[PDB]
Amino acid sequence: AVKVGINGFGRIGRNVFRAALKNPDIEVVAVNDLTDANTLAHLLKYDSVHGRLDAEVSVNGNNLVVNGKEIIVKAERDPENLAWGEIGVDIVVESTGRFTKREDAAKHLEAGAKKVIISAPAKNEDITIVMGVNQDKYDPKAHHVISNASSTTNCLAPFAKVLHEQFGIVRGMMTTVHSYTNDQRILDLPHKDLRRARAAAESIIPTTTGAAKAVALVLPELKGKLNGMAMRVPTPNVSVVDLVAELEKEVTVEEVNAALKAAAEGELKGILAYSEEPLVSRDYNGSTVSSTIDALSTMVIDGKMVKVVSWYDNETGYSHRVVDLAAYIASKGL
Amino acid sequence: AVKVGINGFGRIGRNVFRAALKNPDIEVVAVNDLTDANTLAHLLKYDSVHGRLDAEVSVNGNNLVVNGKEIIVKAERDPENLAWGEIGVDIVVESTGRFTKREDAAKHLEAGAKKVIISAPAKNEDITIVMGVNQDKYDPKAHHVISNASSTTNCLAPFAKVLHEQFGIVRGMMTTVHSYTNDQRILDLPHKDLRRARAAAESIIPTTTGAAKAVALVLPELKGKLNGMAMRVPTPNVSVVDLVAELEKEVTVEEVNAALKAAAEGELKGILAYSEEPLVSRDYNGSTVSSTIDALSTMVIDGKMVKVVSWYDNETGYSHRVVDLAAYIASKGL
Amino acid sequence: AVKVGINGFGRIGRNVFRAALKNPDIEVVAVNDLTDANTLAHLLKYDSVHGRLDAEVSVNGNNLVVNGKEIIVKAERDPENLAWGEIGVDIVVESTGRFTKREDAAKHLEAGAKKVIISAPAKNEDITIVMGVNQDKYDPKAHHVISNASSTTNCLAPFAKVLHEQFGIVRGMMTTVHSYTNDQRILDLPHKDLRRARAAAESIIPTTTGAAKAVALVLPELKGKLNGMAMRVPTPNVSVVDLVAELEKEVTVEEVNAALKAAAEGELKGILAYSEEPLVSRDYNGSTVSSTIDALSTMVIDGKMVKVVSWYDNETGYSHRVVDLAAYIASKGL
Amino acid sequence: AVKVGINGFGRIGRNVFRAALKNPDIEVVAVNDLTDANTLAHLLKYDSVHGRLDAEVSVNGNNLVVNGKEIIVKAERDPENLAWGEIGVDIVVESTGRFTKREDAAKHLEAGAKKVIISAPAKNEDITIVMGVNQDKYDPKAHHVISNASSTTNCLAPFAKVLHEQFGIVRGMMTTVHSYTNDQRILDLPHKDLRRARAAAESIIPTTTGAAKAVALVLPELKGKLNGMAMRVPTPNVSVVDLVAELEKEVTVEEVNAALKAAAEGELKGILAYSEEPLVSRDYNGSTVSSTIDALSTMVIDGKMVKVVSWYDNETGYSHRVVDLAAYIASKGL
Ligand SMILES: NC(=O)c1ccc[n+]([C@@H]2O[C@H](COP(=O)([O-])OP(=O)(O)OC[C@H]3O[C@@H](n4cnc5c(N)ncnc54)[C@H](O)[C@@H]3O)[C@@H](O)[C@H]2O)c1
Ligand SMILES: NC(=O)c1ccc[n+]([C@@H]2O[C@H](COP(=O)([O-])OP(=O)(O)OC[C@H]3O[C@@H](n4cnc5c(N)ncnc54)[C@H](O)[C@@H]3O)[C@@H](O)[C@H]2O)c1
Ligand SMILES: NC(=O)c1ccc[n+]([C@@H]2O[C@H](COP(=O)([O-])OP(=O)(O)OC[C@H]3O[C@@H](n4cnc5c(N)ncnc54)[C@H](O)[C@@H]3O)[C@@H](O)[C@H]2O)c1
Ligand SMILES: NC(=O)c1ccc[n+]([C@@H]2O[C@H](COP(=O)([O-])OP(=O)(O)OC[C@H]3O[C@@H](n4cnc5c(N)ncnc54)[C@H](O)[C@@H]3O)[C@@H](O)[C@H]2O)c1
Ligand SMILES: O=C[C@H](O)COP(=O)(O)O
Ligand SMILES: O=C[C@H](O)COP(=O)(O)O
Ligand SMILES: O=C[C@H](O)COP(=O)(O)O
Ligand SMILES: O=C[C@H](O)COP(=O)(O)O
């Protein structure tokens, strides 16, 4: 249906491309990075985390060919020169990691695009959306630069929503044991965050995160009630959220898990999932949901303080949410 | 001073041996395992985690020779046949992982020993001690099978003590992101804990832990107020405790860190430490304290809910505590 | 058709089971290990290396149920008590790693089985076979305890055959950079091999191997012509053979590769593969062939010394070969 | 005595700095990178691979202070603007990895330095040197931009020299199982080498290397006699050379080892080492020699083909060699 362009064909860029292959409402016609079609084709075909792509992938001189279709490969460091209007691109997925500020992301619009989905927390965005939580707050007439938040926020918000609406959250704190990402370093290198400067595959690395705070963007009633941190560990993908919260209503572990399960099988199906299996991170690689409750970990003290643990494939779940968001925005009119 | 024997010359066994080398009050004269002196000597000399031992290590036919001294090497699967009385051993460090029940640990006494320190949570022990917290509760006349608890409990209790005495803990929950240990598995193998059965170096592995509950053993006032879980990750050593707690007194981050720092430089010096540095797990390898507060991570909401993060070398800190406990018990009379 | 039993439902056992699902000629009716069906079913369903099993898995009573097919679960430590005959099991895959000596493997025959396939180099076996190299040497009348060799030998032998028959091998030496296995240790523990005693995921670990010499078992002409070693590294699966050999005929890189490619698409199709893609180990996880030539790495000096590098998923390839051998044996008559 | 400047205060830069602390003949007075002193001081103080620096470290103004000695911190991306002459820097260690071509390295000379040591294989350098092999070929009058080669070449060359002079090398091929480096990628990213583009800590990664051919630069007699490759694996530091060579003289394993041991305790003392211990990579972290023979791995066939395996801490050994070379050059007159 709607033509989409991907700026930054990396971990999210290529995983969003995979998800798009399954969505009839969106079609990727062009991708932009800092290399040649031959390199991008090779990366799209062989993935160290998700295995070989199940699709026809080859190179057509200067472009990529996936399942017969031809994808235009651009190599423009400056977004202002992407010329999206010339190839009919209406929605651009901004996933380079360098244009999270609206002043920069808006360049895609100047280039002919109509909507821009920043694949991460943004600065001065028209609106931040978490699919399954507040997409209804989207305004096709006033929202042009949209943020799909972080995958961590996408994992916490859905179950934070359930807990609050059913029991009411007084306050809480979270920690996400998160797989390392390309924002880190291989061997002790300069980084604004002296924690992230350290060898990623060698340590448990505490680092900041605004995921708990960002929840308020999508769930206003929780403004100022949540905070958190992250701990980057030596795994290449899949992360887990650990929330400890004080509730208003007196509850038991059974009632908490029951409510989470009902929501996973109800209105949040596909967004929130519920698992009573004693699994580990490798088990969620490839998971497409935004959040899967590890029911066995649910814990309660004095019937007021609760611990909820939820899994998430930070690359896959979020990538599918980006696609869902692209399709939703499209169904509202461009 | 007092002659000590080590049953199970593994990670804790050999690290306790290192610590003992620095303690004038204790002397290791014999070690028992399931192999030959040649293998134990090689393991004591080259350590994948802590580097080459700085000491003279060789083999004397059937025994080990460390810095001129000769250590008797035993290979008795059954503790009942250790004959500690024949070699003057008064205190035995039970660190095989197979004799945590008093009925089994007591065998060391039957063999001629006077005291037994189980290097882990135990069953029916005469008393569980956390150095710096409740060693005063030790009774030389009635306590013969002692548990030094877990390293996780040894990391949480000291700062749990401070928080409670200064602000009062209503209730709290913890999660320890812990390095993998030999209790896990290399590649998906049977294990009572289906979580721990999974490849240790490949996933983030949630697992049970009684560390939060065990705190009550050493801090009675906290009985039933704390619970927790663990998440085993792909690091070979060093772990971190993440405690979220509701306090009685209204506080600020500054006051919380101030109290922790004062205690680290005061009565808990050597047991509890305080760090304002943005470090990572590799930075604590070799740390001898039981708990080091990561001050930068301290967080507070509504002045009542607090998050305290503390580091610990699960092998080194605990091993030194085992030695401290051996010396303390000795100073009370055998 | 032929009923098969698996003794040692571990890394190779389970992989064999999955491979068997593809061959309608062999039916796995029972498996034996040292745990309960609940545990074996859980391990079979979720694999840290190969992902989630694409089949229904449940536990019925004290047996496993895969896609509705019931599989008997035994938990007998002593092979003499397996009673294979009682359930019509004619072929047993011995993959415990504990019964490689014929006197032990032969216990399965005493228990009623007609043929035993030892999933590893053996001692006093009636014959060692490498599919695609010497299966024709199997003699149904005299061979009852068969060895399928090691995964390393299954990788080397096929292309070693091609090099010798096509160019003649004077002598050669190989090194296999191999993923760690359950024979190693998590954190420095006793082991007959002081090298494998060390933390598997923390070092490059040089270790010995008879894979180079075992090739002579299946290629008698190469007796005394090859030798080698292994280097275990921090990866959970997939390994690679690196052979340096002196050839008789003077050749060029193109010639050597042309021959290997010819054999891969010809006589060794399904056993030996040929790739001109610049891939890495993760790309071969799940590979069902015994050996894939990494053509880009082919090297020649003075037209006499050549280097050939070949990939192999040590768990999957060998396990599929095990099933091929079982079917082969059955077709020869039991 | 001689004032030295380090350009690129990374893995090699910092290791060089630490090595320099041991040599009173060279004084590092300034370092340059792309960040601030606060960041460089933090990196120098806490190392994920080599531990905590055993020295006082602080930041005075905008400079570093190590054990009271002040070190100028520069942050100039363009070497022409380093003004080395202005601060009396005569020798510059070029370790950014960006200036291996002489036209770039020569910018340090334009800036006032008298000699430049490129910490890697170079292009159009006046001469490439491997301490203990060809330092005598350095000519103070004509050599201003010098290359210290690669760490792999520094490991191979020394024992290759011994084998050729003692037995004569017909031809050989090597493979270095090498730890990952900052030249690789965390998670599948663009890279000129499609192999190094892949997740460094997740695979065994075959890659090319000129180390085998570069040995000819320092051992002209071996021109056209050697070639090889590298295999990057999931370890943060320490690598190992695996050489398979055809010799002229017929020898035995004992002979080959006897010669290597003789050279290690003789002419190559401090450069080449000899070990008969069954060690693993972690045991060599911190090793200051360029090459340590793993004698237990020595292999011989037909008394003509030999396999020699040698260990090397790729960061430390080379960095110490860099300091040796700087002192050597200085002693030749500037
Ligand atoms: N990886 C995750 O777990 C995750 C999850 C959710 C959101 N995110 C967010 O998504 C964004 C991308 O993250 P990632 O992990 O995919 O990073 P990445 O480094 O894997 O991919 C970024 C890609 O953009 C390219 N690039 C850089 N500058 C460019 C430019 N000027 N023009 C065109 N291409 C350019 C790079 O070459 C690379 O291919 C970030 O903002 C990040 O915070 C990451
Ligand atoms: N590793 C840690 O982080 C840590 C920290 C604190 C406490 N602990 C506890 O300490 C104990 C030991 O743990 P570890 O990590 O040292 O384990 P380990 O496996 O490294 O060491 C155990 C040693 O005991 C030996 N052994 C087994 N059975 C024996 C027997 N019957 N007789 C004599 N020797 C025998 C083994 O050969 C081995 O050398 C456990 O109870 C554990 O829970 C572990
Ligand atoms: N892993 C590889 O890459 C590989 C490849 C080819 C061959 N092999 C060989 O196959 C064998 C098994 O290797 P693995 O990696 O699958 O090992 P593993 O440790 O993963 O599996 C062995 C299984 O046998 C069970 N077991 C042990 N003793 C038993 C007994 N007495 N009775 C019944 N069950 C018992 C264990 O519980 C376990 O599940 C070895 O001989 C090995 O050398 C391994
Ligand atoms: N790491 C090893 O094992 C090893 C061994 C021997 C030689 N080398 C070689 O040494 C060089 C550096 O390797 P490394 O592993 O230390 O790399 P690194 O990436 O760890 O360090 C390079 C440093 O240079 C800085 N830098 C980059 N561009 C700069 C510029 N224009 N001006 C000033 N500073 C800049 C970076 O910020 C970084 O701190 C390379 O040529 C490499 O091949 C590496
Ligand atoms: O998954 C959580 C965030 O989206 C991670 O962002 P990062 O690219 O900074 O790792
Ligand atoms: O450090 C915490 C516990 O002591 C770990 O015990 P474990 O041997 O079961 O890993
Ligand atoms: O692939 C090589 C062998 O099959 C490894 O056997 P192992 O179980 O002894 O490691
Ligand atoms: O040790 C080998 C080389 O020094 C590696 O250089 P690199 O930085 O290109 O990985």
Place of tokens 């009542």: B304
Instruction: State whether B235 and A231 contact (CB < 8 Å).
Output: no
C-alpha span between A235 and A200 (Å, rounded): 9
- Structure tokens that stand for B175 in this block: 């999660």
The DSSP symbol for B94 reads E
CB-nearest partner of C171 from D179, D199, D302: D302
Chain A, residues 81-120, CB within 8 A of chain B, namely: none
The token pair at D48 is 């994920």
Tokens of C262: 């010819």
CA distance A57 to C277: 14
Backbone phi, psi, residue C60, to 5°: -110, 105
Cα dihedral sign for B259, B264, B266, B271?
Answer: positive
| Among chain C residues, CA nearest to B33 | C190
Distances (CA, A) of B207 to A253, B195, B224: 18, 6, 20
Neighbours of C45 (CB within 10 A): 18
CA distance B148 to B319: 10
Contact C293, C273 (CB under 8 A): yes
Q: State the nearest Cα–Cα gap between A312 and chain B, in angstroms.
A: 12
CA B182 to ligand 2 center in whole angstroms: 8
Residue B25 CA to chain centroid, in angstroms?
A: 19
Give C57's contacts in chain B (Cβ within 8 Å).
none
Amino acid at the residue C68: G
Other Cβ atoms less than 10 A from the Cβ of A77: the count is: 11
Nearest to A130 by CA among A6, A222, A236, A245: A222
Atom of ligand 6 at shortest range from CA of B312? 1
Residue A73 tokens, joined: 């490969």
Closest CA to A238 of A155, A315, A318: A315
- Around C130, how many Cα atoms within 13 Å sit in the side-chain half-sphere? 29
Alpha carbon distance A114, A145 (integer Å): 9
| Tokens 């060029």 found at | C252
Cα gap D21→D64, rounded to integer Å:
14
Q: Is A203–B281 a contact, with Cβ atoms under 8 angstroms apart?
A: yes
**Quick check: D279 and B46 CB within 8 A?**
yes
* Alpha-carbon gap, residue C179 to C315, rounded angstroms: 10
Structure solved via: X-ray
Cβ atoms of D64 and D70 closer than 8 Å: yes
Whether C72 contacts C49, CB under 8 Å: no
Amino acid, single-letter form, for residue A229: M
What's the farthest any 2 CA atoms get from each other in chain C?
Answer: 66
Strand segments (E) across chain C: 2-7, 26-32, 46-47, 51-52, 57-60, 63-66, 69-74, 91-94, 115-118, 127-128, 145-147, 169-179, 205-208, 226-233, 239-247, 272-275, 291-294, 299-301, 305-312
Q: Rounded to the nearest 10 degrees, how much is the dihedral formed by the CA atoms of A109, A113, A114, A118?
A: -70
Spatial CA neighbour of C21 closest among C312, C329, C320, C315: C320
Nearest-Cα residue of chain C relative to residue D228 = C299
A180 CA distance to ligand 4 centroid (A)?
22
- C234 in A contact zone (CB under 8 Å): no
Place of tokens 């990691």: A97
On whether the CB atoms of residues D14 and D44 are closer than 8 A, the answer is: yes
Taking chain C, what is the end-to-end CA distance rounded to the nearest angstrom?
A: 12
Tally Cβ neighbours within 10 Å of residue A115.
25
Residues 296-315 of C with CB under 8 A from D: 296-297, 299, 301-302, 304-305, 307, 309
- Asked if residue D123 has its Cβ within 6 Å of ligand 4, the reply is no
Centroid of ligand 7 to alpha carbon of C179 (angstroms) = 9
Distance CA C43, CA C114 (A): 29
Give the C-alpha distances (Å, rounded to integers) separating B133 from B159, B226, B241, B321, D157.
10, 17, 17, 12, 58
Resolution (A): 2.0
Element (H, E) at D307: strand D305-312
Phi, psi (deg, nearest 5) at residue A299? -140, 145
Q: Are strands B205-207 and D127-128 parallel, antiparallel or unpaired?
A: unpaired
List phi, psi (to 5°) of D176.
-110, 120
Residues in contact with D68: Cβ distance below 8 Å, sequence separation at least 6, in sequence order: D56
Distance separating alpha carbons of residues D82 and D104, to the nearest angstrom: 13
Q: Which of A234, A240, A128, A236 lies closest to A174 in space, CA to CA?
A: A240
Are the beta carbons of A17 and A44 closer than 8 angstroms?
A: yes
Instruction: Give the span between the Cα atoms of B105 and D76, in whole angstroms.
Output: 65
Q: Which amino acid type is present at position B106?
A: A
Strand-pair category, D239-247 with D169-179: antiparallel
B199 in Cβ contact with A270 (< 8 Å): no
C-D CB pairs within 8 A amount to: 143
Q: Is the CB of D184 under 6 A from ligand 4?
A: no
| Residue D297 tokens, joined | 């791995």
- Residue D294: CB atoms within 10 Å: 22
Q: What count of other Cβ atoms lies within 10 Å of the Cβ of residue A223? A: 11
Locate tokens 């009062």: which residue?
B168
> Of all atoms in ligand 4, which is nearest to the CA of residue D43?
39
Q: What are the angstrom distances between the C-alpha of C170 and each of A253, C156, C165, C226, C244?
A: 71, 16, 12, 9, 11
CB atoms inside a 10 Å sphere around CB C334: 12
Bridge partners for C73 per DSSP: C31
* Separation of alpha carbons D274 and D291, rounded Å: 8
CA distance B302 to B306: 9
Can you count the helices (H) and strands (E) in chain C? 8, 19
Q: How far apart are CA D148 and CA D133, in angstroms?
A: 11
Phi, psi at D108, each rounded to 5°: -65, -35
Q: Counting Cβ atoms within 10 Å, is residue A197 exposed (0-12), middle (13-18) or buried (19+)?
A: buried
Helices C316-331, C151-167: inter-axial angle, 10-degree rounding: 80
DSSP H or E run through B254 = helix B253-265
Residue B307 phi/psi, 5-degree rounding, is: -120, 125
- Domains with residue ranges and CATH for chain B: 1-149+315-334 (3.40.50.720), 150-314 (3.30.360.10)
Q: Give Dmax (Cα) for chain B.
A: 66
Give the span between the Cα atoms of C271 and C265, in whole angstroms: 10
Chosen from C48, C178, C313 to mutate, greatest number of chain B CBs within 10 A: C48
Of the candidates C67, C106, C111, the one whose C-alpha atom is nearest the C-alpha of residue C88 is C111
Phi and psi torsions of D93, nearest 5°: -95, 110
For a mutational test of ligand 7's pocket, the pick from C119, C150, C177, i.e. the residue with the most ligand atoms closer than 8 A to its C-beta, is C150
Chain B segment 236-255 residues within 8 A of C by beta carbon are 236
What tokens does D42 get?
Answer: 């933090």
Cα–Cα–Cα angle for B306, B310, B312, nearest 5°? 160
Residue B40 has a CB neighbour count (10 Å cut-off) of: 27
Tokens of B258: 């101030």
Among candidates A314, D175, D206, A288, which has minimal Cα distance to C284? D206
Measured between CB atoms, does B39 come within 8 Å of chain A?
Answer: no
**Count of C-beta atoms within a 10 Å radius of residue D33:** 25
Ligand 1 proximity of A77 Cβ (cutoff 6 Å) = yes
- Using the 8-state DSSP alphabet, how is residue A6 labeled? E
The neighbouring-strand residues paired with C275 are C294
Q: How far is CA C293 from CA B149, C229, D185, in A?
A: 54, 19, 25
Of B177, B229, B301, which has the smallest distance from its Cβ to A204's Cβ? B177
**Tokens linked to B269:** 């010096």
A8 alpha carbon – ligand 1 mean position (Å): 6
Under 8 Å CB-to-CB from D309, ≥6 apart: which residues?
A: C206, C229, D240, D241, D242, D243, D293, D294, D297, D298
Going from the C-alpha of C15 to that of each of C53, C72, C100, C169, the distances in angstroms are 11, 17, 19, 34
Q: Is D228 in the pocket of ligand 4 (CB under 6 A)?
A: no
Strand partners, A233: A179
- The verdict on a CB contact (< 8 Å) between B11 and C199 is no
